[PDB]
Homo-oligomer: A and B are copies of this chain.
């Protein structure tokens, strides 16, 4: 596990550069690295021309990583680069910084929740959702602990316990606790 040093203002950028860098080499030989002082503490794997990532969980055996990029699909990485500077306009008018964009996907997606339940545009596919959370995460410098803990609990839950209804609802209260500190209640309230 090479830890490599950041060469851009965004992790998404350093990741885009190595991804193309290592793309060829990766078809014959899996590469594997960390970024220095990654606030999200991800392990990155280049295998077979794809980039994968999972936040590191100590207790937990990881049997499941998440795709950051494929050859014809780098727009995830690129969009976190742009998004990191100017956030995101949703099609119904509004504007979200990359952190609120991620907080939204993590805490205000009932389709996502529903899919987590069921585990043990609007998507309902748990892995797709997480992958996209991962992509946002690579554009965010100094994330509030609730994005960090949020991404870790979701990525843990899916490393299967053949997870039970109990593990799901334990998770659904934890995320609510975090949705609670992340957003001021009185703001959730004016959003209906």
Give A contacts to B, CB under 8 Å: 7-10, 13, 16-17, 19-21, 23-24, 71-72, 74-75, 78-79, 81-82, 85-86
- Is B8 in contact with A74, judged by CB distance below 8 angstroms? no
| B21 close to A82 (CB less than 8 A) | no
List the 4 closest pairs (A to B, CB-CB), nearest first.
A85-B85, A21-B72, A13-B78, A20-B74
Known: A8-B75, A13-B81, A20-B71. 20 other contacts (CB 8 A): A7-B75, A8-B78, A8-B79, A8-B82, A9-B82, A9-B86, A10-B82, A13-B78, A16-B74, A16-B78, A17-B75, A19-B20, A20-B23, A20-B72, A20-B74, A23-B23, A23-B71, A78-B81, A85-B85, A85-B86
In the assembly, how many copies of this chain are there? Answer: 2
A17 near B74: Cβ-Cβ < 8 Å:
yes
Chain A contact residues, majority secondary structure = helix
A24→B71 contact, CB < 8 A? yes
Instruction: Write 10 A-B pairs (CB below 8 A) sorted by A numbering.
Output: A9-B82, A13-B81, A13-B82, A16-B74, A16-B78, A21-B71, A81-B81, A81-B82, A82-B85, A85-B85
CB distance from A45 to the nearest CB of B (A): 18
Inside 8 A of A75's CB, which chain B residues have their CB?
7-8, 17
A51, chain B: closest CB distance, angstroms: 11
Task: Kindly list chain B residues whose C-beta atoms are within 8 Å of the C-beta of A24.
Answer: 71
Chain B's closest residue to A24 (CB) is B71
Contacts of A7 in B (CB 8 A): 75
